[PDB]
Structure 1
């Protein structure tokens, strides 16, 4: 039972949004069905407040938050698992990521990336210097998805704090409780309350206000392509940082030894199945060159069978549920359909509500919905691709997405060919597409994002205006 947090105040409403635990579809919490007026108030407070925190004070708040996350991780991951349905293993891991986000944002506070230009450069030159500096925006709108109820909020809120911005968060109504808890932690860690609000409600009531409120200088959104494209249409003349899906490959080249195939298999399974496969950067396509497929697939199969799927609150569970039963149903459907198109299902112990096992499918036609569309579940789909890198690259690039990628090979020449040729934001050699540090530049192209980078450092830049000034010299 959680009210909204509007600049530190608990704000309630009559109507409720029920939050259900996807494992057994029971109500585990309720939050307000907030309305435009609530967001509107949150933004007015945000706009009127001018943060004056020193970099030291910002760092203290961010580092205090990091410890609170560590200290309370069991509690916080319980909340995550209860609304999202991912295993405690995955949700404990999420708290670790959020711990990194706050720690790195805290540490980046001592950093000033100002520049200096000399002006006596051309025939038009002058004896003068130009200096750079950053300033915060009026207010920032953050809209977050169900997949990382904690880490997604952390990524949007920590850089805002670090830069003396005021942010208003609207988490998805599917997983709003983690956000509300994070706000409480932040207020306790000493954040001036005006710097953060978390509002909840139905998209038809409060969603549009997040996009159109006149005080909002920047909308930062992570979510689906259709909602993303909608936002891009409706947030006129506001800066927008849009992080949409991925359809990311793990590419297995034919130079690999059997030992290496086994490591690549480890990556494939982990990358496909972590967070119940609910990552923009999950392995959604395992592109295996024909030559090595017969050796590779059995290794994948063997690993997929070891995974324990079931009760997410059980600490020995590897793989919990996906967000809900109809997502699970849709994913299994895409599997069945691939099979009818010629795919070979190797492992499928059966779906149970929102609980999908780590289904292994081989010889997936790469046109088939399963892999052409983004499939946001723990499917392990192997697409057999030619023993030709140009063909492999063209195939890898043939979807509407372009976020991240993983390539397993020991041949440098081929490595750099893929690095140069994949149309994506990130190419990871010998790691899953999902691999990054919380502060490296993160973002996709094509349908994966509108082309701006995120991660702690780029978010901090993104959340400021550069002001220049020049002095006689």
Structure 2
């Protein structure tokens, strides 16, 4: 049992949200069923506190947080694993990522991107200089999804501390214990408590206050398309950064050697299954050009069968469960349905509740639910595509989504064609769509996002207002 953390204070309610372990379906935790008034309190505090931390101070707090994450890595990945169900291997890696996010935000504190303009540029010119500076906002509202219960929170909070913002986080009711623990880490690392609250409860009770509270200057939301478009229909006059679903391809081009196909098959299986497939930039469609597929698909199958799927707490498990059994059952149905439409299931040892094996299916029609909709689980679906780049680019672009992509090829002419032609936020050559560093620009277009970039650097910019000032300069 864990209360809300409202500016450093433990806050409770009579009602409870239960948090269950997807492996077991047992209750492993409880948090408050928070209401509009808790968020309201959290925001009034955030609005009123004016952080004074120097850049050195902010850096100390962020670097001390990284060290605490490293020192408590097993404890934290256990909490992640117990609410989300992903393997210890995946949750320990997630802690590694959060350690990088805090570390980099800490180091970004020394950087000042101020610019200077001279004003004698036109016949209207003046002997004057204009300078820019950045300042924090009144309050930030962050709403996070279940797939990285630690790292999504780190990406929203670390840039807020680094720019002297006060943030209120509402993690998902599915995986809220990890955010609450991060809050405690932060306060113990020296964060002035009014800079961070973590509130919890049902989306119908507390969700809308996160979107409409008068003090909020910026709402930063990561989650599903429908919830994203709902928020977009309601945050009247606030900035919103909405980072929504992905459905991302790994594209295998026909110039590859057999050895290259093995390396591509390594990227395919890892891309489709890491974090149980629960990444917005997971490989969700492997688009394999006809003339190499016969060679490529048996290499994928061989690698998928090595994956050990089972008890998430076992350090030798590769693949843990998905978020719940309902999601599992749904991805299984999409497979079974793609198979009625002509797909060829090549490996499916059987679902067990929320535990899905890394099912391999070949000849997936591009228009079936499995690959046209976002399938947020460890399916490894191969879609055979024509030996023609334009048709391949057309088909890759034919869903509602556009976040990231991976292309494997050695021919530079074709690399550049895919780079220019895919309608996505990122094109990775010879990497999975999931590849990024914590500070490069990250965000999609089309239904994958409203068009703002994130990652530590862009989030820091997003979280401030630029003020200019000009001075006589004779």
Q: Over aligned residue pairs, what C-alpha RMSD do you find?
A: 0.3
Whether 2:357 is the aligned partner of 1:364: answer no
Cα deviations across residues 357-409 of structure 1 (Å, max 9, x unaligned)?
Answer: 00000000000000000000000000000000000000000000000000000
By how many angstroms is 1:124 displaced? 1.2
SS at match of 2:233: helix
**CA distance in 2: counterparts of 1:277 and 1:121, whole angstroms:** 54
Which structure 2 residues correspond to residues 331-370 of structure 1 after superposition, within 5 A? 331-370=331-370
By how many angstroms is 1:87 displaced? 0.3
SS at match of 1:395: helix
SS at match of 2:142: strand
Instruction: Count residues in correspondence.
Output: 473
**CA distance in 1: counterparts of 2:328 and 2:119, whole angstroms:** 61
Cα deviations across residues 156-199 of structure 1 (Å, max 9, x unaligned)?
Answer: 00000000000000000000000000000000000000000000
By how many angstroms is 1:67 displaced? 0.5
By how many angstroms is 1:28 displaced? 0.2
Cα deviations across residues 126-166 of structure 1 (Å, max 9, x unaligned)?
Answer: 10100000000000000000000000000000000000000
Cα deviations across residues 41-92 of structure 1 (Å, max 9, x unaligned)?
Answer: 0000000000000000000000000000000000000000000000000000
By how many angstroms is 1:30 displaced? 0.2
Cα deviations across residues 395-428 of structure 1 (Å, max 9, x unaligned)?
Answer: 0000000000000000000000000000000000
By how many angstroms is 1:36 displaced? 0.4
What residue number does 2:456 align with?
Answer: 456
**CA distance in 2: counterparts of 1:237 and 1:334, whole angstroms:** 40
**CA distance in 1: counterparts of 2:23 and 2:125, whole angstroms:** 68
By how many angstroms is 1:462 displaced? 0.2
Superposition misfits of 4+ residues, deviation over 6 angstroms: none
**CA distance in 2: counterparts of 1:37 and 1:383, whole angstroms:** 49
In structure 1, runs of 5+ residues without a counterpart are: none
By how many angstroms is 1:305 displaced? 0.1
By how many angstroms is 1:343 displaced? 0.1
What residue number does 2:117 align with?
Answer: 117
**CA distance in 2: counterparts of 1:123 and 1:307, whole angstroms:** 70
Could you state the TM-score of these two structures normalised by the residue count of structure 1?
Answer: 1.00
**CA distance in 2: counterparts of 1:124 and 1:394, whole angstroms:** 50
SS at match of 2:288: strand
Could you state the TM-score of these two structures normalised by the residue count of structure 2?
Answer: 1.00
By how many angstroms is 1:288 displaced? 0.1
By how many angstroms is 1:123 displaced? 1.3
By how many angstroms is 1:323 displaced? 0.2
**CA distance in 2: counterparts of 1:325 and 1:369, whole angstroms:** 19
Cα deviations across residues 208-259 of structure 1 (Å, max 9, x unaligned)?
Answer: 0000000000000000000000001111110000010100000000000000
**CA distance in 1: counterparts of 2:308 and 2:101, whole angstroms:** 29
**CA distance in 2: counterparts of 1:125 and 1:390, whole angstroms:** 50
**CA distance in 2: counterparts of 1:149 and 1:442, whole angstroms:** 19
SS at match of 1:66: helix
What residue number does 1:104 align with?
Answer: 104
**CA distance in 2: counterparts of 1:432 and 1:161, whole angstroms:** 31
